[PDB]
């Protein structure tokens, strides 16, 4: 498919140094998709990445359980962050195939671009 222009949802460091994406609405995205579903998608991604970097009890328990084995357990077990990046990828592809592809837009997984931006590709 041919490309008409690319916009990027820059990262947001306001709350901290943890993965959280900005909620600003692009100017080029106007007349192509209603702001409600875009805000929803960004909010769901924000909540997922918050569940990823969420400190507390589970994270510290898993860390200590790994340190009890000289960090040799990460050769066989998938860590929490990957166990939620899988959900992030699944949600992104399903949301794309559901609502984004009909409008002529593509939503990429931020794990490809280095967890820095979201490369929304506008087609014509």
């Amino acid at each position: 498919a041919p490309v008409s222009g690319k916009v990027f949802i820059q990262r947001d460091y306001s709350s901290g140094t943890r993965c959280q994406f900005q909620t600003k609405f692009p100017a080029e995205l106007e007349n192509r998709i209603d702001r409600q579903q875009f805000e929803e998608t960004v909010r769901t991604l924000n909540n997922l990445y918050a569940e990823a970097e969420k400190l507390g009890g589970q994270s510290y328990l898993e860390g200590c359980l790994a340190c009890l084995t000289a960090y040799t357990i990460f050769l066989c077990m998938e860590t929490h962050y990957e166990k939620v990046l899988k959900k992030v990828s699944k949600y992104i592809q399903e949301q794309n195939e559901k609502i984004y592809a009909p409008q002529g837009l593509l939503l990429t997984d931020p794990i490809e671009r280095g967890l820095r931006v979201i490369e929304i590709t506008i087609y014509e």
Binding site: K6, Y13, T17, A52, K54, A70, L85, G114
Partner: protein, 295 residues
């Protein structure tokens, strides 16, 4: 044959055991560290633990082996792993970023170098200024920096420690700190128990004959004395940067420890939560897939 994503991945890193490793090019001193650790621990386990197990409690060599296996696992995990490298900007995204930059710069005075490309953010009620990287063609995310040796922007950069043979960033700083701590413990342990062995065996045979039996004891004493005199100071320095939640690259700049003493926005105002977030928190995976399949 398949074309993995590491033979094309730019940078000055080395990839062995098929790509599942990532180390610097100047890994000369890494072999020296490995040989020193292994040789001293084998000298111990072969000339002093035997005696201290036959004629003392049999827990000494088992505990020493536990400490040594921990130290080796953490050192190999610090060296082999990916220190959190940021992938370079693709041509279109870099072009778009630089377009925004030049559009925001406006008319530049002639004969004067354009002002440094600096973006200012608000992190935890604090003014934080990122800096452009003319090689990666991105804006360095907060706490990131550029290793001039490896030539790839490491995330939460600390320093390019060659004694472990790899950068030290975010994904392998807990392992580096635990390797340093366990090596300091193992050094204090081997030193104390070698002194105990010499005393307990000289009380039975004498000093000259004990020394003439194995010079491995004085060899290990020298090695452990110098290794302690360095590594203990190192771990004392790091136990105060894993608590205030700072990085060596920032302490060198003297930003938070200087005239201003303004709060580092990445901290938490505590020492327990900081230690927990830096040591036992959650870490991201490798953001550049190396075992990926290129077209």
């Amino acid at each position: 044959k398949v074309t993995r994503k590491w033979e094309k991945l730019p940078g000055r890193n080395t990839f062995c055991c098929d790509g599942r490793v990532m180390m610097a090019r100047q890994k000369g001193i890494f072999y020296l560290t490995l040989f020193l650790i292994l040789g001293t621990c084998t000298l111990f386990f072969a000339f002093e633990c035997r005696y201290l197990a036959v004629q003392l409690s049999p827990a000494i060599p088992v505990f020493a082996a536990m400490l040594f296996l921990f130290s080796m696992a953490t050192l190999l995990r610090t060296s082999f792993s990916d220190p959190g490298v940021i992938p370079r900007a693709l041509p279109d995204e870099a072009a778009f970023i630089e377009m925004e930059i030049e559009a925001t710069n406006g008319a530049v005075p002639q004969g004067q170098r354009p002002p440094p490309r600096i973006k200012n953010f608000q992190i935890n009620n604090q003014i934080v200024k990122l800096k452009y990287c003319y090689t990666c063609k991105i804006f360095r995310p907060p706490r990131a920096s550029h290793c001039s040796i490896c030539d790839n922007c490491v995330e939460r950069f600390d320093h390019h420690c060659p004694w472990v043979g790899n950068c030290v960033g975010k994904r392998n700083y807990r392992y580096f700190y635990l390797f340093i701590l366990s090596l300091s413990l193992l050094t204090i342990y081997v030193f104390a128990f070698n002194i105990v062995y010499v005393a307990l065996k000289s009380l039975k045979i004498g000093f000259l004959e004990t020394l003439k039996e194995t010079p491995g004891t004085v060899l290990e004493v020298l090695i452990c004395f110098f290794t302690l005199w360095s590594v203990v100071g190192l771990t004392g320095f790091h136990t105060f940067l894993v608590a205030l939640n700072q990085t060596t690259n920032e302490d060198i700049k003297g930003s938070w420890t200087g005239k201003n003493r303004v709060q580092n926005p990445y901290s938490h105002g505590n020492i327990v939560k900081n230690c927990c977030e830096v040591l036992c928190g959650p870490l991201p995976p490798s953001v550049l897939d190396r075992r990926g399949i290129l077209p």
